[PDB]
């Protein structure tokens, strides 16, 4: 009697805000949403293709009505009864323009100002090709405190080639089915890759049908999945109106089901980049240290090519690693740019490209900084540590120039060593290690329950390290004897 | 200098309409004037153009319907950060 998808986002131990929908026209008289969704008078859509358009047969409301119902329907919705305002940016044939979408986003910004400051969620169940201006408009809205949620796209492709999917500050949602596997749609299916933040139910989703005011229908697509996460965001903000986007994103990530997806469905080179997360409501209206992993784009084959991974503005970058499938890399470093710490990975002169991999955390009232030492030519290698009192080591980085090679970093003698140090109230971190004589393909070590992985690293002196990265609270080192080094923290 | 951008997916391209994005901190009256400047320049070259919208509040700039012939001209306007060709978005 409970739709599988509503059960699926509901955790074991299971509680003001406005949701804007930019989509097709909606049927606001439908029993699922009546009196709770308002149709704004905004609409900016292209003409239908008249050679295939028969107005009398067409159901112009079908897509938007169903999505409003998934978000806030009284019987089948995620945030039942939630308040919604709809804007029409898609015509009867499901088509809109980047320009119309911009004008719709501007309209929302306009409303936010003259209306009583409160949390707002914007659901964008649509996609086009990568657009610089559309991504920029979304970023600008996100920095004004708006939570934007969008579909990853239905093309079984890398979501970073689409917008607004590829906008970093937007929450991008892929679709999974009742078996928690990626949805197939025709011969295609949910998009994937590093621009997808998480997945949510997106197959066989029951919801309001505009056929009639009490009618229901089942639909599939990443639109439906994004609608689930918009509902979840709405329930979270309804209980904690003060929650910021950064905090909300970290919580969505933290409370999702981990590792329920078989990654074999994704192309091989996307498996490491794609989060294995299926959305769920936090079992809680509501302290702990949240961190997430952020992969950069591939650097490219150039000998001097670099990749950059950045954190959200409210976040601190606590560590920085790098990965190359070929293994040919020159390490990584944490640099300052615009008074913000970024993670820069450097490519080897014979390499095809590297990823930079940042670890981004919410650490209130933290003052972090980087400390570097140049190469040494010593038996103890190159070393740096956090001198200042109350400053804790949260991560180590190392980059070198040549090709062939408590609270302290140790790197190769030929390499520069970089240490991330933070001062924050009650911050304590410790190191955990694990080595294996015969590296079968990867060495890992995880932080104990209650601790958060902030740094992930391999011990220097090895020739067969492809790189290292955090997966949730596990540190993963990739080899072609090797030791994985985790830095784990918490706030007492 | 000012760059031009278009959708990588050729069939989703909508040539003939462009978002002209101006450098940030550009004020509304400046975007308004830059749009009218483009129109006057294009008119002297025998081109009809239409300003469809002038943005303020999210991004500074304007939406213009015009021939792609004029892109080089538009890229030389004062305050221009970059210009993007309109393109389609689709229900998912």
């Amino acid at each position, epitope marked *: 009697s409970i739709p599988w998808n509503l059960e699926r986002i509901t955790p074991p131990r299971y509680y003001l805000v406005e949701v804007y929908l930019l989509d097709t026209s909606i049927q606001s008289d439908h029993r699922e949403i009546e009196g709770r969704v308002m149709v704004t008078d905004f609409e900016n859509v292209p003409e239908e*293709d008249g050679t295939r*358009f028969h107005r009398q047969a067409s159901k112009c409301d079908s*897509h938007g009505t169903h999505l409003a119902g998934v978000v806030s329907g009284r019987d089948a919705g995620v945030a039942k009864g939630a308040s919604m305002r709809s804007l029409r940016v898609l015509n009867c044939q499901g088509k809109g323009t980047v320009s119309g979408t911009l004008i719709g986003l501007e309209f929302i910004r306009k409303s936010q100002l003259v209306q009583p400051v409160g949390p707002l969620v914007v659901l964008l169940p649509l996609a086009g090709g990568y657009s610089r201006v559309l991504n920029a408009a979304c970023q600008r809205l996100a920095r004004a405190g708006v939570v934007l949620v969008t579909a990853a796209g239905n093309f079984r492709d890398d979501a970073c080639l689409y917008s607004p999917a590829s906008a970093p500050e937007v929450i991008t949602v892929g679709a999974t089915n009742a078996q928690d596997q990626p949805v197939t749609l025709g011969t295609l299916g949910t998009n994937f890759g590093r621009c997808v933040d998480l997945f949510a139910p997106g197959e066989d989703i029951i919801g309001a*049908s505009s056929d009639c005011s009490t009618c229901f229908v*089942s639909q599939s697509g990443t639109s439906q999945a994004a609608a689930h996460v918009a509902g979840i965001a709405a329930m979270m903000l309804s209980a904690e109106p003060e929650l910021t986007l950064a905090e909300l994103r970290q919580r969505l990530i933290h409370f999702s089901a981990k590792d329920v997806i078989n990654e074999a469905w994704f192309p091989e080179d996307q498996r490491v980049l794609t989060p294995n997360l299926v959305a769920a409501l936090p079992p809680s209206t509501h302290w702990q240290l949240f961190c997430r992993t952020v992969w950069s784009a591939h650097s490219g084959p150039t000998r001097m090519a670099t990749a950059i991974a950045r954190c959200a503005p409210d976040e601190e970058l606590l560590s920085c690693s790098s990965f190359s499938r070929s293994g040919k890399r020159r390490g990584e470093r944490m640099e300052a740019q615009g008074g913000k710490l970024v993670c820069r990975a450097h490519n080897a002169f014979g390499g095809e490209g590297v990823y930079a991999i940042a670890r981004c955390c919410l650490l209130p009232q933290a003052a972090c900084s980087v400390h570097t030492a140049p190469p040494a030519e010593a038996s103890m290698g190159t070393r740096v540590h956090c001198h200042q009192q109350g400053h804790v080591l949260t991560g180590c980085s190392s980059h070198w120039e040549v090709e062939d090679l408590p609270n302290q970093c140790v790197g190769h003698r030929e390499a520069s060593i970089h240490a991330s140090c933070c001062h924050a109230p009650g911050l304590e971190c410790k190191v955990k290690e694990h080595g294996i004589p015969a590296p079968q393909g990867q060495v890992t070590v995880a932080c104990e329950e209650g601790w958060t992985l902030t740094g992930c690293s391999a011990l220097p002196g090895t020739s067969h390290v492809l790189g290292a990265y955090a997966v949730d609270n596990t540190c993963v080192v990739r080899s072609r004897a090797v030791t994985a080094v985790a830095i784990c923290c918490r706030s007492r | 200098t000012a760059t031009f951008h278009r959708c990588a997916k*050729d069939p989703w391209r909508l040539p003939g309409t462009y978002v002209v994005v101006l450098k940030e901190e550009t004020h509304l009256s400046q975007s308004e004037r830059t749009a009218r400047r483009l129109q006057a320049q294009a008119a002297r070259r025998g081109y009809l153009t239409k300003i469809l919208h002038v943005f303020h509040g999210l991004l500074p700039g304007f939406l213009v319907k015009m021939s792609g012939d004029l892109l080089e001209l538009a890229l030389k306007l004062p305050h221009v950060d970059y210009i993007e060709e309109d393109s389609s978005v*689709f229900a998912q």
Partner: antibody
Amino acid sequence: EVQLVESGGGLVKPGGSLRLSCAASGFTFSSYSMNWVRQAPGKGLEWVSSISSSSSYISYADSVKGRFTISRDNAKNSLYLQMNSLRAEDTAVYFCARDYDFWSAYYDAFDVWGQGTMVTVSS
Amino acid sequence: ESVLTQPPSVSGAPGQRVTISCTGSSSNIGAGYDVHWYQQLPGTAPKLLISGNSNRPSGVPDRFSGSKSGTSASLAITGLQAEDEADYYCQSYDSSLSGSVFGGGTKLTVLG
């Protein structure tokens, strides 16, 4: 499993009418476009008509334009083809086939077909 | 009389490699629409063989491959097997017709 079963075929005289149905099961019908494709005995496949998931795209081959009318009923998981003013040349097996509705963003393959229903038009 | 042109027939012995071409125009294949291929065994419904120019559905052996170039596309079958005897159809959307039309079909015969 995913399944399509068309019915309604028969023998009819020139100038007459038939109504084909196609029942879908095993999948989310309301997110798929549907199509009729026909094949005269010993001949090639011929696209007849297409209708999108919300019926906002509808089109017809020239050869049936004005005589055939496609429609669908998502609540009943059904696709219809109303055939009027039938001619001998309309004699063929008629298949239905689905393709996921990408709203013209992409035109996917017809990835599942029915087994077809036979239609003969003869004096 | 079909918008897409295929050779009427092709043949090979078990083990050989054969190809089937599909040529269209600027209103379909040359307009950026993908070609999809179908196999129809004698007395059955068509089934999907290659989608999106070159993708194989689950259950289709890697002996089958497809490619597209310009206004034409090609289906290739290596290690020809007896059960490959069938008719093969290409398909592509055509923007002037507003429909996804089919080639005239190629009859493949397994010899030897």
